[PDB]
Amino acid sequence: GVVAAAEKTKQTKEGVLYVGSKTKEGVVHGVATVAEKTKEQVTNVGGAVVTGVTAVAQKTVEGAGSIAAATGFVK
Amino acid sequence: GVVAAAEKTKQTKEGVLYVGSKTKEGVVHGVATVAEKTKEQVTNVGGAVVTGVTAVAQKTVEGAGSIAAATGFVK
Amino acid sequence: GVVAAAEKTKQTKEGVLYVGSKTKEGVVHGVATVAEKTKEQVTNVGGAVVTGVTAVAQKTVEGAGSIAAATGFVK
Amino acid sequence: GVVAAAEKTKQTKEGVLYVGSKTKEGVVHGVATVAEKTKEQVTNVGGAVVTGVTAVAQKTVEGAGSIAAATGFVK
Amino acid sequence: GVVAAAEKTKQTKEGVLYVGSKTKEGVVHGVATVAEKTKEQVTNVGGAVVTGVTAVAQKTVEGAGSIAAATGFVK
């Protein structure tokens, strides 16, 4: 029942990017799931995750983008 | 029952980006799920997560973007 | 029953961005879910999360954007 | 029953952004869910979350944006 | 029941990128799942994860992109 459908039917400076970064110390951890003495952990990450000292996300979804996620359990 | 549908049907400086970043110390953790002595944890992250000392998100969803998420459990 | 539908049907400086950032110390944690001695935690994050010392979000949803989320449990 | 639908049907300086930030110390936590000795926590965050020492959100929803969220439990 | 379908039916400077990065120390961890004395951990990461001291994501989804994910267990 977890359905993700994406359809795209298609019948000057555009999207131009300039980044200049100067970093001395950089610690980036991105997507992280840490468990200590944990019993029962469920984690889900979906989509676009842009992370860091200089993070730029230009025009992430120009067409069709669908994210379906059923996260959990049954007892 | 967790359905995400996206449809895009398509029949000068546009979206131009300039970033200049100068950082000495940078610690970025992004998406994180930490559990200590935890029993039963459910986490869900969806979409666009732009994070960091200099975070820029230009024109994230130009077309169709759908995020469906059922997060949880049954007992 | 958690349905997210997005449809986009399409039949000078536009969206131009300038960021200049100068940071000495930067700590960014973004999306975080922390549990200590917790029993039973349900978390859900959806959409666009732009975070950081210099956070810029330009024209996040130009088209169709839908976020559906059922977060919780049954006993 | 948690339905989010978005439709966009489409048949000089526009949206131009300038940010200049100069920060010495910056701590940004974004979206956070912290539980200590907690039993039973349900959290949901949806939409656009722009956070940080310099946070700018220009023209977040130019088209169609829908956020549906059923957050809670049944006993 | 975990179905992801993507269809794309198709019948000046465009998408041009400039990055200049100068880093002295950089620690990047990307996607990480750490468990210590943990019992029972389920993790799922899907989509585009761009991470690092200088992270740039230009035009991530120009066509059709669908991410379906059922993350969890049954007892």
Residue numbers in the entry:
A (entry chain B), B (entry chain C), C (entry chain D), D (entry chain E), E (entry chain A): 14 to 24, 33 to 96
Sentences from the paper on this structure:
α-synuclein misfolding and aggregation into fibrils is a common feature of α-synucleinopathies, such as Parkinson’s disease, in which α-synuclein fibrils are a characteristic hallmark of neuronal inclusions called Lewy bodies. Here we present cryo-electron microscopy structures of six α-synuclein fibrils in complex with lipids, revealing specific lipid-fibril interactions. We observe that phospholipids promote an alternative protofilament fold, mediate an unusual arrangement of protofilaments, and fill the central cavities of the fibrils. Extensive classification during 3D reconstruction revealed three dominant protofilament folds (L1, L2, and L3) that form in total six different fibrils by different quaternary arrangement.
The L2A fibril was determined to a resolution of 2.7 Å, 3.1 Å for L2B, and 2.8 Å for L3A. The L2A fibril is composed of three identical L2 protofilaments related by a C3 symmetry. Interestingly, the three protofilaments are separated by ~20 Å and thus show no direct protein-protein contacts. A striking feature of the L2A fibril is the bridging of lipid molecules that span the ~20 Å gap between the protofilaments. The simulations revealed that lipids interact with the segment 33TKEGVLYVGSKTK45, bridging the gap between the protofilaments. In detail, the acyl chains bind to Y39, V40, and G41, which form a small hydrophobic patch at the fibril surface. Additionally, the lipid head groups interact with K43 and K45 on one protofilament and with K34 on the neighboring protofilament. Hence, the negatively charged phosphate groups and the Cl− ions together form the bridge between K34 and K43 in the individual protofilaments by forming a well-ordered interaction network. In the L2A fibril, lipid-mediated interactions seem to be essential as they connect the neighboring protofilaments. While micelle-like lipid arrangements at the fibril surface can potentially also result from diffusion of lipid molecules after fibril formation, lipids in the central cavity of L2A seem less likely to originate from this process, as lipids mediate the interaction between the protofilaments, suggesting the presence of lipids already during fibril assembly.
